């Protein structure tokens, strides 16, 4: 219920990439959940060449008001 | 996994009740999640006696950062 997405929308937007602090994060829908990211596109594909793990991560949120 | 947990107090703590808009919400943990209901228990259990369910609702939010 929409009302959820708004918030989803608002906690995306106000935390940018845990790395280069900047852009935003990437994130993905699966299955009936949001996954956000630690970073950003850019700063992950960098973080698997430069070999750090310290900010790889993600949380998963609903994507509906009643589970 | 704790981050997640500090985004649902840092949501419950931004969002006053509804209807007074000064108290916070009710809410109870079902199973893996949290339900933020609309009201504060004073508000909702007068929206009762009053006869208006205009403000009855909730959000649910998964309590782990992994789905
Ligand atoms: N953009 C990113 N920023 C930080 N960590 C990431 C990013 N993309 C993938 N990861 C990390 O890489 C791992 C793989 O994630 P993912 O592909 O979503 O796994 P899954 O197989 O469960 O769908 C996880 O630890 C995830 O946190
Ligand atoms: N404090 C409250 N504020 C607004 N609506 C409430 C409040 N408490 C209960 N409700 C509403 O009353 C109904 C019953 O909720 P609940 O007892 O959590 O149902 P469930 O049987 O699924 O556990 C729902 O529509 C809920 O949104
Ligand atoms: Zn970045
Ligand atoms: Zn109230």
């Given at each position: 219920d929409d009302?959820?997405?708004?918030?989803?929308?608002?906690?995306?937007?106000?935390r940018p990439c845990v790395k280069c602090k900047?852009?935003?994060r990437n994130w993905k829908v699966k299955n009936k959940?949001?996954?956000?990211?630690?970073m950003?596109?850019?700063?992950f594909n960098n973080?698997?060449?430069?070999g750090d793990?310290?900010?790889h991560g993600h949380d998963d949120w609903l994507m509906?008001?009643?589970?």
């Amino acid at each position: 219920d929409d009302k959820k997405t708004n918030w989803l929308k608002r906690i995306y937007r106000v935390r940018p990439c845990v790395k280069c602090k900047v852009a935003p994060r990437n994130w993905k829908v699966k299955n009936k959940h949001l996954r956000i990211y630690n970073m950003c596109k850019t700063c992950f594909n960098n973080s698997i060449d430069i070999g750090d793990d310290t900010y790889h991560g993600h949380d998963d949120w609903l994507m509906y008001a009643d589970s």
